A = this chain, B = another copy of it.
Amino acid sequence: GFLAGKKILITGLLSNKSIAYGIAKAMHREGAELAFTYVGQFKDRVEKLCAEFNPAAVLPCDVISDQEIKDLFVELGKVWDGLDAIVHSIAFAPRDQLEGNFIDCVTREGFSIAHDISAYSFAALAKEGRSMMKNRNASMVALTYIGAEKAMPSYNTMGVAKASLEATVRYTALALGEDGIKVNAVSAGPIKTLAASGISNFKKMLDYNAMVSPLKKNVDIMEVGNTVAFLCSDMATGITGEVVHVDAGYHCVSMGNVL
């Protein structure tokens, strides 16, 4: 496996639909040793889910909390000497930030929270993980969405937070590259995960994507997972600060034949 021996922390595993589930399968297949995090209530759920991946640790981490993030690396440092990669697969905005007119729905607090959990959290993991990752061709990868680059209906505050995430990825790439750490993002096409559960006509975004994309299909968690896996391998050591679209080519087309 091209990840044989590498010690990789995966955040955001919540169901077998999670993008993080696909990341896990791909990394496990490629011989990575895996650790996982969960937010408080979901301890048992997550422990069952990642059992199949022989995890070295399954640890709490609510990225709202500086203390929990700090404690995550203290506990992880007890099982591993160094850390090869961090996979960030976490987003949150309050429900009201996510449908209807952007300007009608945006609030100061909703905007704050979405950025806090969706963007700042990446730099926070970077900040606390840094010393374990020093000088071993380490990697970070964040999950992002094209709503960062374009105004889209509904995505609203999450789009703005994603834009802040991608910039964070670039500044993190600049800040960590001297320690040999590469820092990148994967822009996934829409996938029906628990993140989709709030959103009405999500299935419609999905059908639209399959209709307009060059490849005439929807991506799945394995396509995303495989790419994240690649971005954590010695094969990708020349790539940093990059956003790789795994979206069946949605990002490169405008309009199409079916208007």
> What residue of chain B has the Cβ atom nearest to residue A229's Cβ?
B235
Identify which of A87-95, A141-149, A246-254 touches chain B: A246-254
Contacts of A244 in B (CB 8 A): 239, 242, 244
Query: In the complex, which of the residues A2, A26, A182, A239 has the most CB atoms of chain B within 10 Å of its own CB atom?
Result: A239
Is the CB–CB distance between A177 and B238 below 8 Å? Answer: no
Q: Is A154 an interface residue (CB 8 A)?
A: no
Q: Is the CB of B227 within 8 A of A238?
A: yes
B contact residues around A2 at 8 Å (CB): 2
The reply to whether B236 and A241 contact each other, CB–CB distance below 8 Å, is no
A82 within 8 A of B: no
Q: Which residues of B contact A251 (CB under 8 A)?
A: 241-242
Cβ-defined contact, B215 with A253, below 8 A? no
| A252 and B189 in contact, given A236-B227, A242-B244 (Cβ under 8 angstroms) | no
Chain B residues with CB below 8 A from A252, complex form: 170, 173-174, 240-242
Instruction: Name, among A230, A236, A240, A248, the residue most crowded by chain B CB atoms within 10 Å (CB to CB).
Output: A240
A239 contact from B227, B229, B240, B242, Cβ within 8 A: B227
Which listed residue, B219, B238, B245, touches A242 by the CB 8 Å rule? B245
Shortest Cβ distance from A244 into B: residue? B244
How many residues in A have their beta carbons less than 8 Å from beta carbons of B?
41
Nearest-neighbour CB distance to chain B for A233, whole angstroms, equals 8
Q: Is the CB–CB distance between B235 and A227 below 8 Å? A: yes
* Distance in angstroms between the alpha carbons of A145 and B236 in the assembled complex: 17
Known A-B contacts A239-B245, A246-B239; the reply to A216 vs B174 at CB < 8 A is no
Contact B241 A230 (CB under 8 A): no
Residue of B nearest to A182 (CB): B215
Question: What are 25 pairs between A and B in contact, CB < 8 Å?
Answer: A26-B235, A170-B252, A170-B253, A173-B249, A174-B253, A176-B214, A177-B215, A178-B216, A189-B238, A214-B240, A214-B241, A215-B240, A223-B237, A223-B238, A227-B236, A230-B230, A238-B247, A238-B248, A239-B245, A239-B246, A240-B249, A240-B252, A241-B249, A241-B252, A244-B244
